[PDB]
Amino acid sequence: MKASRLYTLVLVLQPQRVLLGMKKRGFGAGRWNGFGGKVQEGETIEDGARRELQEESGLTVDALHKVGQIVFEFVGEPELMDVHVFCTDSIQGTPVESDEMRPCWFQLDQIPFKDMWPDNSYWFPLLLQKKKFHGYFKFQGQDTILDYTLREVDTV
Numbered sequence: 001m002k003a004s005r006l007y008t009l010v011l012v013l014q015p016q017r018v019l020l021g022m023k024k025r026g027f028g029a030g031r032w033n034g035f036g037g038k039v040q041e042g043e044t045i046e047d048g049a050r051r052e053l054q055e056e057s058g059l060t061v062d063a064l065h066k067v068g069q070i071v072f073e074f075v076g077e078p079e080l081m082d083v084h085v086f087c088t089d090s091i092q093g094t095p096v097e098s099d100e101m102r103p104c105w106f107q108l109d110q111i112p113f114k115d116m117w118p119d120n121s122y123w124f125p126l127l128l129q130k131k132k133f134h135g136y137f138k139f140q141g142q143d144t145i146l147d148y149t150l151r152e153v154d155t156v
């Protein structure tokens with residue numbers, strides 16, 4: 001197969017709203033996304049998710065809940081992105097804007113799907129229903145899905 005690199009993604013989901021971060025600079029600026037990044041050597045995936053949430057947004061949490069796993073493949077990139085998806089509802093601190101990311105709350109009837117990664121339209125709804133999932137999405141560039149699979153699972 002291909003090799004994969006481990007990433008995290010954290011959705012701060014409360015009963016009526018979700019916190020997302022807008023990419024401010026670089027390629028892909030303007031898109032809203034959960035918080036996360038590459039897992040580092042030595043840490044568990046969950047601890048890496050907590051670390052990235054704090055580094056990116058300022059927020060801390062005692063614990064996260066794992067809700068999904070999604071593999072992303074990009075045309076022209078040999079390495080797969082293996083993204084472990086977590087959900088907070090409980091959080092310490094206020095979110096902080098950085099030079100790279102602007103955080104913003106959205107009501108759950110105003111989820112900004114058109115300005116999110118296209119895959120989020122498929123798996124976000126499961127997350128809102130408190131379901132767990134496994135997914136795979138192959139992209140041409142940033143906007144076009146060529147193939148995907150999505151399945152609800154009982155155990156992630």
Ligand SMILES: Nc1[nH]c(=O)nc2c1ncn2[C@H]1C[C@H](O)[C@@H](COP(=O)(O)OP(=O)(O)OP(=O)(O)O)O1
Binds near residue numbers: 117
């Ligand atoms: N199709 C997609 N759908 C989605 O919802 N999140 C995606 C995505 N593609 C990438 N991401 C998320 C996964 C992860 O949280 C982040 C990508 O990680 P980054 O490259 O930002 O990692 P790092 O911040 O560790 O990188 P460095 O700045 O080089 O350290 O974007």
Ligand code: NA
Binds near residue numbers: 035036038
């Ligand atoms: Na990141």
Ligand code: NA
Binds near residue numbers: 037
């Ligand atoms: Na990182």
